[PDB]
Design a protein around this ligand. Structure first.
Ligand SMILES: *Cc1c(COP(=O)(O)O)cnc(C)c1O
Ligand SMILES: *Cc1c(COP(=O)(O)O)cnc(C)c1O
Lengths: 435, 435
C-alpha cells in the first residue's frame, strides 16, 4: 500500500482521528517530521507526545554500525525478559542505573506502557501498606486507597482511571474506586508568596482530613511533579515538601509519576531532583521507551515487599527488548553529549522568547511558564487556543494542546536555538490572525 | 558485560528468579534456545510463555533482506501510532485483517500488553452497556460488572486483578471490584455426557442467578476458551453456546480472552472458531506481538460506542511499531506455509504420544488433553509435577507448569515430529526417576 492509501486502509478497521500526514520513517530527522505524501517538512514540538528524547533518526544511532547489529538482533525476536535474561538486557539495566539511577531507589522493574508503570508503583504501595499495617497490629485488609490531585493524568488503565481527571471523555462510564482527591495548588499569574502559601495550606488541610477520616487505609500519595495533560501546571517545592512530611506522619508512600517530566526534559534526569523532595517510588515511561518503576526509601522497611518476593509483580514480556536496546543507546548519547545541560540552556532560551511574546501580546499570550524544555502558555479562551493550533499546523509547526486553554511545547532535547526561533516566528505570524 | 556476569549485573537492581541460562540471541533458532554461557542447546516447549509463533530467528525473517530494511526503519524510532500513521502500520493492519480477521468483528484496536488488551475489551463493554441501558430508559450508572470464571487468568492490571484467580500470590493485598464469579465446568477424566451436562447446568444456574440479582449491571461475560494458567482446562462447546444465549437474553456482551489460545496454536486462527460460538469481542496478544481487540457483532448496535467516538480508548504509542512490522512478516509466513494446518496435524501427533504415555504410566500420567499444539497432562501431586519439570530441565527440555499439577506444552507452530519425539523421550526418561 502507498502513502496516499494509508488513511483509507486504516479507516476500514479503526477510527482515524490522527494527523493529516503520513510519517516518512526514513527522511524524517532531528526536529523535523516529513510527510510521505507531499515531502513537506514539519517542525516538531510534539515529539510523539513527548516520548522522543532525540527526535527522529538521530545521527548517533543511524551512523553506528555496531549498534545496528545489536538492534537487529533484538528486533528479530521478542523474548520474555521476565524469565529469560540476555546480555542486551543487562547492558540496558546497568546503563539505566548509571545515567538515571538514584542511590536511594535501587529497585528497578520494567513493563510495557506508562499506565502500567504507574499501576506497578501503586501495587508496591498497596502491598507495603497492608504489610506495614500487619506488622503494627493493624488489620492487613486496610491500605487500599490512593491520595491524588485534581487535574491529574496517570493513564487509562483499571487503577489509573480512578486517578485521572482531566477530560470527562477519558473516564466516563468506566467503573472507579472511590479514592480521595484534593485541590491542586498550582502556581498562577498574580499570586504573591502569601497568596500561594494560603492556596497550599488549603490543599494540605484537605490532605490531612483525608488521612484522618480513612485511618490506615491510604497507602500512598501520587502526583505529577508538573501536571502535563491537565495544562502544564507547576507547583512550588514547598507544597511537595509539606506533602512529603504529611505522608511520613501517616505512614504513606510518596510516588511521583515522571512519565512525562522524566528523562531530562526539565533539565535534570528527573523533575523531583529539582524540587528537593525524595520520593519512595518513581514511575517512568515515554522517553525511556521501556516503562517501569524505581523504588526504595521507605519501601525497604517492609522486608517482604513486592521487589523482594517472587511473582508479586509481572508481565509476560517484562518490557520490550528492542525498546531496551534503543533506550540504552539513547542514554549513552545523553550522557556523552551532556544533553541534560543542553536542556537547561535551551529551556532558558525558549522561556525568554515566551516572556517576549507575552510582552508584545499582553492580553493574548497568558501565563508563559516552564521548567527546562517543558514550556507552555495559555490563551484567553479554548476557541483561541484551538485556532492557534490550526494556524500553526498550516505553517507546518506541530504543537499539542493541554487543558482548556494551554499550548504546550515538547521539543526534543537536541532542539537548536534556530529551531526554537522558527517555532516562535510561526506563533508571532499566527497570533494577529487568531485575535 | 559478559554472559557469565548477566545474573550478577541484573541482581543489583531486580529480583532474578528466571531461568539459569543466558539467551544467545544469534545462535538460538527454531525449536532450540542456546545458553550463551555453555553453548548447550535447550529444546523449547515454552516459547516465551507461548508468545513465539515461529520460535527464534525464523529463516523466513532472518534471510529476507527487504524485510531487514523494513524492520530496521521501524526499530530505530518509536512513533505514537495513535496520532501518526505510516505505511509500515497500514501494511500490518491490512495483513492482520486478512489472515486473522473475522467479517463479524471489523473494529480493530492495538495496545502494548495482554492485560491492557483485555482491559480495552472490558471498557468497550462497560460503555456499551451503560449506553444500551440509557437508550432503553435504564439508569446509565448501571453496567459496571463482569461475569467471569473460577480459575481464570486475564492479567495483572487494575481491572484484570478483579478477574484473575489462580495463585493467591498474584492478587493478594491488591484492591478489587466485587464482580460475580461462577464455577468453571471443565472436562475431567471419567465423566460421561450426562455427568458433564449436569456440571454445566450448575455453572449456568450460577450465571443466571448473577444476572437476575444484579439487574442491568452485568456488562459482559469474559472467558478463556481454554484456561491456560489455571491448568489447561478445556470446556465443551455446549457450555459456551449456552452462555452465548444467556448473554443475549440479558443484553450482555460475550468476550473471549484469546491472548494464550490465539494465532493458530489450537489449529485455527482463534480457538472460538472451533467452538462454533460467536463472541462480540476478542482480546489477543502474546504471539501477535502487538496486543489488542477485535470487536463487532452486538457492539455496533450502540452507534456511539468506543470504536466510533474519538478518545474513549487510547494509549501514547498505540502498540509498538517494531512489533507490528515483525507480526506482519510472521502472519505472511503463517499464511504462505499453511501453519494453521501444520498445527492441526502435529497437534494430533503430540496428543497421540501423550495417550501412549498415559497407557504406559497409568497412575502417573493423568488426563492427557489438548486442542492443536496446546497440550498438557497432569501428575498425582504438585511435588511430582515440580520434580518432573526439574528432571526435564536437567535433560535440556523447557516446559512450563500450570495449576497445582499440570505440565503444559507450548511448542512453536513450526515444531517437527522429531522434536516432539525428543520431548516425549525426555519425559519417558524422567518419569521412573520421579515415581
Ligand atoms: C503518558 C502518561 C501516562 C500514561 O502513559 P501511556 O504509555 O500512554 O499509558 C501516565 N502518566 C503521565 C504523567 C503521562 O504523561
Ligand atoms: C498472557 C495472558 C494475559 C496477560 O498478558 P500480559 O502481556 O502478560 O499482560 C491475559 N490473558 C491470558 C489468557 C494470558 O495468557
Amino acid at each position: 500500500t502507498t502513502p496516499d492509501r494509508v488513511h483509507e486502509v486504516l479507516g476500514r478497521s479503526m477510527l482515524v482521528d490522527g494527523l493529516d500526514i503520513v510519517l516518512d520513517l526514513t527522511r524524517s530527522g532531528g526536529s523535523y517530521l516529513v510527510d510521505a505524501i507531499t515531502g513537506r517538512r514539519y517542525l516538531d514540538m510534539f515529539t510523539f507526545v513527548a516520548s522522543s528524547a532525540l527526535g527522529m533518526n538521530p545521527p548517533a544511532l543511524v551512523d553506528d554500525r555496531e549498534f545496528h547489529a545489536e538492534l537487529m538482533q533484538a528486533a528479530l525476536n521478542k523474548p520474555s525478559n521476565s524469565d529469560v535474561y540476555s546480555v542486551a538486557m543487562a547492558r540496558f539495566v546497568e546503563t539505566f542505573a548509571r545515567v538515571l539511577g538514584d542511590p536511594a531507589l535501587p529497585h528497578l522493574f520494567f513493563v510495557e506502557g506508562g499506565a502500567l508503570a504507574v499501576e506497578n508503583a501503586l501495587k508496591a504501595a498497596f502491598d507495603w501498606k497492608s504489610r506495614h499495617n500487619q506488622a503494627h497490629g493493624i488489620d492487613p485488609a486496610l491500605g487500599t486507597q490512593v491520595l491524588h490531585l485534581r487535574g491529574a493524568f496517570h493513564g487509562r488503565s483499571g487503577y489509573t482511571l480512578s486517578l485521572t481527571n482531566t477530560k470527562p471523555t477519558i473516564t466516563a462510564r468506566f467503573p472507579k474506586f472511590d479514592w480521595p482527591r484534593i485541590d491542586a495548588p498550582y502556581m498562577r499569574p498574580g499570586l504573591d508568596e502569601p497568596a500561594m502559601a494560603a492556596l497550599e495550606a488549603e490543599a494540605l488541610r484537605q490532605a490531612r482530613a483525608a488521612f484522618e477520616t480513612r485511618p490506615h487505609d491510604i497507602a500512598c500519595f501520587v502526583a505529577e511533579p508538573i501536571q502535563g495533560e491537565g495544562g502544564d501546571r507547576h507547583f512550588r517545592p514547598e507544597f511537595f515538601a509539606a506533602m512529603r512530611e504529611l505522608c511520613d506522619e501517616f505512614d504513606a508512600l510518596l510516588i511521583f509519576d515522571e512519565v512525562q517530566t522524566g528523562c531530562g526534559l526539565t533539565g535534570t534526569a528527573w523533575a523531583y531532583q529539582q524540587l528537593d523532595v525524595a520520593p519512595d517510588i518513581v514511575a517512568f515511561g515515554k522517553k525511556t521507551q521501556v516503562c517501569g518503576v524505581m523504588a526504595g526509601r521507605r519501601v525497604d522497611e517492609v522486608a517482604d515487599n513486592v521487589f523482594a518476593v517472587p511473582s508479586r509483580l509481572n508481565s509476560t514480556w517484562g518490557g520490550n527488548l528492542t525498546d531496551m536496546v534503543r533506550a540504552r543507546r539513547i542514554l549513552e548519547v545523553i550522557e556523552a553529549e551532556g544533553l541534560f545541560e543542553r536542556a537547561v540552556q535551551h529551556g532558558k532560551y525558549l522561556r525568554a522568547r515566551l516572556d517576549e511574546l507575552a510582552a508584545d501580546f499582553p492580553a493574548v499570550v497568558l501565563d508563559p511558564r516552564g521548567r527546562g524544555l517543558m514550556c507552555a502558555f495559555s490563551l484567553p479562551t479554548t476557541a483561541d487556543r484551538d485556532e492557534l493550533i490550526r494556524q500553526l499546523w498550516q505553517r507546518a509547526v506541530i504543537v499539542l494542546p493541554a487543558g482548556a486553554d494551554t499550548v504546550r511545547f515538547r521539543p526534543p532535547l537536541t532542539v537548536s536555538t534556530a529551531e526554537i526561533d522558527a517555532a516562535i516566528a510561526a506563533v508571532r505570524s499566527a497570533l494577529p490572525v487568531v485575535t
